[PDB]
UniProtKB/Swiss-Prot annotation:
A GO cellular component entry from the record: cytoplasm
Matches recorded under InterPro entries: Barstar, Barstar-like_sf
Function: Inhibitor of the ribonuclease barnase. Forms a one-to-one non-covalent complex.
SUPFAM superfamilies registered for this protein in UniProt: Barstar-related
Keywords: Cytoplasm
Organism: Bacillus amyloliquefaciens
Protein name as catalogued: Barstar
Assigned protein family: Belongs to the barstar family.
Pfam families assigned to the protein according to its UniProt record, in alphabetical order: Barstar (PF01337)
Length: 89
């Protein structure tokens, strides 16, 4: 229902995936890559979903903009109709 990312604590793309793994209660063998993220959104996660992403710009610098691609996956599921709310602090 509610997943939180403290971007200040992010140090890489995998950190993001593993945080997401914990915050969204993803599958034990979740793949930690952009494709696994799409698959978990379409066939694992329960909606309504609120994803609060704090200090987004900081996580952006610390992942060589990788956070932007992870964010695109959520926006894509949203464009396709998924009930997701993203809060970018």
């Amino acid at each position: 229902k509610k997943a939180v990312i403290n971007g200040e604590q992010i140090r890489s793309i995998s950190d993001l995936h593993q945080t997401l793994k914990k915050e969204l209660a993803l599958a034990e063998y979740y793949g930690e890559n952009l494709d696994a993220l799409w698959d978990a959104l379409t066939g694992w996660v329960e909606y309504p979903l609120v994803l609060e992403w704090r200090q987004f710009e900081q996580s952006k610098q610390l992942t060589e903009n990788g956070a932007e691609s992870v964010l695109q996956v959520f926006r894509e599921a949203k464009a396709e109709g998924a009930d997701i709310t993203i809060i970018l602090s």
